[PDB]
Nucleic acid binder design. Structure first.
Ligand SMILES: [Zn+2]
Lengths: 131, 51, 154, 135, 89
RNA sequence: GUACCGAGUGAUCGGUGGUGGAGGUAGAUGCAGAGCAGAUCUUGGUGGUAGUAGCGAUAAUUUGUCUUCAGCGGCAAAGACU
RNA sequence: AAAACAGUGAAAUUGUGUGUGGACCCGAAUGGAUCGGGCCCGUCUUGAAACACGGACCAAGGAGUGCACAUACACU
RNA sequence: AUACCACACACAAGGGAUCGUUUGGCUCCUGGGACGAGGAAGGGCGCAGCAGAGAGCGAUAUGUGUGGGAGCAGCAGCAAUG
């Protein structure tokens, strides 16, 4: 049960809040679980998927496959994974997008600011965990 | 006619730049849903009231 | 894809269909009606005579107040007509099926027009101005067409 | 399906051949397409059917009601009960002399198999037995 | 006659664009606008509630009024170079 | 939603075979914006009449030739008109 | 003013094919000619099949409701 | 009635009812009740690499500072020197 009356439980309101999200709230939509080993290598339980990271598909047509993330579509919430595609009548191949939550991370791309992003989150935990 | 005031001329100039179809590249954009520009006019079918 | 209005085998038949054609509906079905069950070479010969005013199309359903004519006696009626615009279209359509027949490896002979039908397409709107400040409709009535010809068993 | 209630076997044909096939169509439903066939009583001031002139059709009423014993009886000599569960057949265990079961349309294939198996061992007649499960 | 033939003579134009309201309703001979009463200081009485709500605050852009509300929310902080003047006052 | 078949004096109810592609009832009670043929009813869609009535006040048009792809369109030569 | 899903896709109305009839309904039948009975509904009116008015056709919408105050009945 | 007119059924047309769905409306409650001579409210005109309408913004028409951090929806180009 919910006892805070400032938070809404309306279906109409929850749905609008989802689809009209922007900025950091949009980034929260692209989160995926880490594998059991990585959850010992790092403190975090889940992270936003980025290009170059390595993922196992755990639901759908392409179940059991593994591959590298090629692109991240923020407007239509989908991820393109290397080697997951369909062939047209022409023989031409189109990558099919997968929803973030159907993936699981196997190796992290550590290019750019990723190491600082991870550090910032670990500290935020401990700050309140140790109190 | 040939004699015009400055105020009448600016109204004609603005009414002439607005009278154009949707550019052909916009139709390819993922989020774009318009078919035809409903604000297009013809001198044979409407008056501007520039007077 | 198109669902033709009846069931005949793909082997031993040839087909065509067109949509929204801009020949006039009522004129076209009077043409189609008379060439049903006719042999294809006979059909093409007959339609050539209509273009030259040597033979006519008889009329039976869309026929009120029509003119009487000695050429109609060949079909046991008095009433007939010469709808040039519809005849030119149907003639072209039939000639193309002989190309298809030849290319497909049937004979150019013993082909008989087994099925043919016309349907109404949606109206194209127009206007005419009348007296006392009124406006009245002035629309156009196009058509859709199907044909299937088959080889006689004989 | 060719089955009959054993208590009525030597009588069922007399019963069936005795049932009326009269229909009570609404007045002038034959004249305009906007009036459906479903019965409504005419209430006009001039109306020839309400006033019961000879040559107009007949109106419904209590005189046409069937005898209390024959009423509701299917042509196989049983009355019907609707079922949708295995636990429904359990009700018929005392009544199987006069009543039979009809599985509701929305029950799907996998479940129908379980209903029919139970019907066989309890000794209950099911009239939709073939149903969708012919394939 | 009073119908079609009299329509041919209708080539003069009594109203032009008003400089206060845009509405092509300034009567040149009377020296007055029929929408907004220019050149009188106050705006005209509008005929009914339906017609007046079409020209109320919030029907346009409200540029200044929106900024003022944001500044009030923030506590009127001013330009940060000049904090010392603010603090003294 | 559509064909058939059964049950009821009747308002209506049930099943079977194709189509459709995600929700739905049976019993007892509660609240109502709760049942249509009509109002020169309101809105939207479609017939018969009908390939019919009409489409041609004014100076007028013919021949060749190219396009057009089938425009008395353009160009030459005549014939007219304001 | 109109205009939701690139779903489902009714009726009016049209073409083709196959059957049955010559406006149609009720009662009763034949291998087959048909026999008997029936004027067009709604409405005002002493009185309508009317030379009384409304109605070309189909879909969808479309008319005894809420509150206050006394009241008789049924139920607690 | 060979071909017209009517009705029934199957297939193709013609129209948008029905059922399933909804980032909209309405009602009640709680907060708020903040404009202008330091030029308001309202009107006009300009500003994009390809740009009509609408949105955003004023010739500084995506500038500065703080907190964050991965892409910019099409095509060509940009981006941890943000
Ligand atoms: Zn003004």
């Amino acid at each position: 049960m919910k006892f805070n009356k400032n938070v809404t439980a309306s279906r109409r309101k929850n749905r609008k809040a989802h689809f009209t999200s922007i900025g950091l709230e949009r980034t929260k939509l692209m989160n995926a679980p880490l594998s059991k080993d990585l959850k010992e290598e790092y403190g975090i339980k889940r992270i936003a998927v980025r290009p170059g990271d390595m993922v196992k598909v755990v639901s759908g047509e392409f179940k059991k496959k593994e591959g590298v993330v090629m692109k991240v579509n923020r407007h239509d919430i989908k991820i393109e994974v290397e080697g997951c595609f369909v062939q047209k009548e022409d023989g031409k191949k189109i990558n099919k997008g997968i929803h973030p939550s159907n993936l699981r991370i196997i190796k992290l791309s550590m290019e750019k600011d990723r190491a600082e992003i991870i550090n910032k989150k670990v500290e935020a935990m401990k700050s309140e965990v140790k109190a | 006619g040939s004699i015009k005031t400055r105020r009448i001329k600016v109204q004609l100039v603005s009414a002439l730049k607005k009278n154009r179809c949707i550019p052909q590249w916009k139709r390819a954009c993922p989020g774009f849903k318009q078919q035809y520009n409903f604000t297009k006019r013809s001198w044979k079918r409407k008056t501007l009231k520039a007077c | 894809a198109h669902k033709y209005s009846c069931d005949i085998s793909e082997a031993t038949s040839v087909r065509s269909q067109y949509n929204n054609i801009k020949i006039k509906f009522k004129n076209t079905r009077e043409v189609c009606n008379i060439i049903k069950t006719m042999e294809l070479n006979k059909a093409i010969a007959y339609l050539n005579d209509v273009l030259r005013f040597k033979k006519c199309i008889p009329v039976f359903r869309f026929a009120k107040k029509c003119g009487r004519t000695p050429q109609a006696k060949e079909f046991g009626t008095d009433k007939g007509k010469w709808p040039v615009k519809s005849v030119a279209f149907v003639k072209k359509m039939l000639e193309d099926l002989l190309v298809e027949a030849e290319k497909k490896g049937l004979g150019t002979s013993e082909l008989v027009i087994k099925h043919i039908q016309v349907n109404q397409a949606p109206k194209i709107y127009g206007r005419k101005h009348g007296a006392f400040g009124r406006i009245k409709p002035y629309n156009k009535s196009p058509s859709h067409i199907e044909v299937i010809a088959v080889k006689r068993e004989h | 399906m060719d089955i009959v209630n054993p208590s009525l076997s030597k009588v069922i044909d007399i019963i069936n051949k005795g049932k009326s096939k009269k229909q009570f169509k609404r007045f002038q439903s034959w004249r305009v397409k906007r009036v459906s066939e479903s019965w409504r009583k005419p209430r006009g001031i001039d109306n020839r059917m309400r006033r019961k002139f000879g040559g107009a059709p007949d109106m419904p009423g209590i005189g046409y009601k069937k005898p209390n014993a024959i009423r509701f009886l299917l042509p196989n000599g049983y009355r019907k009960i609707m079922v949708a569960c295995v636990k429904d057949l359990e009700a018929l265990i005392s009544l199987n002399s006069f009543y039979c079961a009809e599985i509701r349309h929305a029950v799907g294939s996998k479940k129908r198999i379980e209903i029919l198996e139970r019907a066989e061992e309890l000794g209950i007649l099911v009239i939709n037995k073939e149903g969708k499960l012919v394939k | 006659s009073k119908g079609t033939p009299s329509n041919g003579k209708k080539n003069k134009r009594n109203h032009t664009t008003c400089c206060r309201c845009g509405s092509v309703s300034f009567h040149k001979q009377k020296g007055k606008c029929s929408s907004c009463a220019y050149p009188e200081k106050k705006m005209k009485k509008m005929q009914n509630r339906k017609a007046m709500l079409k020209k109320t605050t919030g029907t346009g852009k409200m540029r200044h009024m929106k900024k003022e509300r944001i500044s009030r929310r923030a506590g009127y902080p001013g330009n940060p170079i000049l904090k010392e003047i603010r603090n003294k006052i």
